[PDB]
Amino acid sequence: ALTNADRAEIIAKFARAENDTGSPEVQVALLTAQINDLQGHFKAHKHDHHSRRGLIRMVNQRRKLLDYLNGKDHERYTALIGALGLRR
RNA sequence: UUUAGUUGCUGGGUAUAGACCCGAAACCAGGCGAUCUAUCCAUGAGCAGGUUGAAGGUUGGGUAACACUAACUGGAGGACC
């Protein structure tokens, strides 16, 4: 699991301003980190359906935020997906 | 109570022997055969040419990741002509 230091590092790397925590870039970066971290857990425990539900919710939330960011500003969307290595 | 036998030689008959001659399918004893053939053991040899394309492998699409999927390789078989 990620800790406070890792989350603070992600927030500092992707913030758009001082004390910025709610921007779509920060939110998508945090969700991507959490999903990538949970991949390892779901490798070991194949039948944790109850936790896989929360994982699916995280994926859906990230997709919605990415769509909103693409609608608002295309350049920021491309920059963010390039930075995090997301295919779309 | 019957009062001529016996020993030779020749002949007829019978008995034991193969017993007038030829003829079985068999049964028993001891030896000879696996240079044919049946199975096995050891050591060698042989199978023109042409098809089909199993497992496995690599790469590419696809997903939150699995899944799924295409192409190329690969050369299996009491496999095919």
Side-chain angles (χ1 to χ4, degrees), chain A residues 23-83:
Chain A
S23 99
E25 283 96 338
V26 166
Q27 291 190 56
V28 167
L30 288 169
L31 290 167
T32 298
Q34 208 169 8
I35 290 158
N36 288 348
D37 186 75
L38 278 174
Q39 277 325 325
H41 164 83
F42 284 110
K43 225 70 91 173
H45 310 261
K46 189 181 156 72
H47 296 283
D48 199 355
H49 306 309
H50 289 65
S51 295
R52 178 160 287 107
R53 249 190 105 232
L55 178 71
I56 298 313
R57 181 216 278 220
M58 284 177 242
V59 173
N60 288 346
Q61 180 138 117
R62 182 177 64 177
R63 165 93 268 118
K64 290 200 259 234
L65 288 161
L66 285 174
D67 285 349
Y68 163 76
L69 183 59
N70 201 14
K72 286 237 85 156
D73 190 330
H74 193 78
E75 319 298 351
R76 282 166 65 189
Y77 165 80
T78 77
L80 182 73
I81 78 175

